[PDB]
Amino acid sequence: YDIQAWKKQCEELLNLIFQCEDSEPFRQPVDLLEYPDYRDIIDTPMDFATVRETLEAGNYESPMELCKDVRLIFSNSKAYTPSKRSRIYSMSLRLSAFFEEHISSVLSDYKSALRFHKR
Numbered sequence: 282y283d284i285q286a287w288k289k290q291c292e293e294l295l296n297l298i299f300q301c302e303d304s305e306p307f308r309q310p311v312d313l314l315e316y317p318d319y320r321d322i323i324d325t326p327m328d329f330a331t332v333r334e335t336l337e338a339g340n341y342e343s344p345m346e347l348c349k350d351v352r353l354i355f356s357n358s359k360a361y362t363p364s365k366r367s368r369i370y371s372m373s374l375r376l377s378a379f380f381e382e383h384i385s386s387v388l389s390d391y392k393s394a395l396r397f398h399k400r
């Protein structure tokens with residue numbers, strides 16, 4: 282029932298994601314010199330360094346907000362990919378599966394703690 286525990290749990294999950302080779306294309310904003318048409322397709326860029334910085338600045342109120350930004354990294358990859366078989370997109374799918382597997386208990390524990398707080 283710790284309402285604040287999600288923050289360190291998210292920091293540790295982000296550390297695991299940064300150790301994972303599949304996260305390398307997503308660690309920093311997409312380079313517009315490498316992908317000149319990126320902003321013609323993607324309206325809201327997102328990357329793991331921005332998520333980590335937002336968390337560390339105390340600019341997420343809940344793990345749901347962090348989860349919305351991480352999911353945006355994956356939906357941007359899906360929207361920008363020229364093929365469902367592309368290398369970078371395929372890395373995004375594995376990383377998404379790993380993230381969802383680990384964020385599930387973070388979200389459940391937070392929501393349960395908040396329900397207990399408001400009982």
Ligand SMILES: Cc1ccc(N)c(=O)n1C
Pocket residue numbers: 306307311316357358359361362363367369370373
């Ligand atoms: C093609 C591509 C390039 C760079 C990215 N970060 C990405 O998500 N895709 C899908």
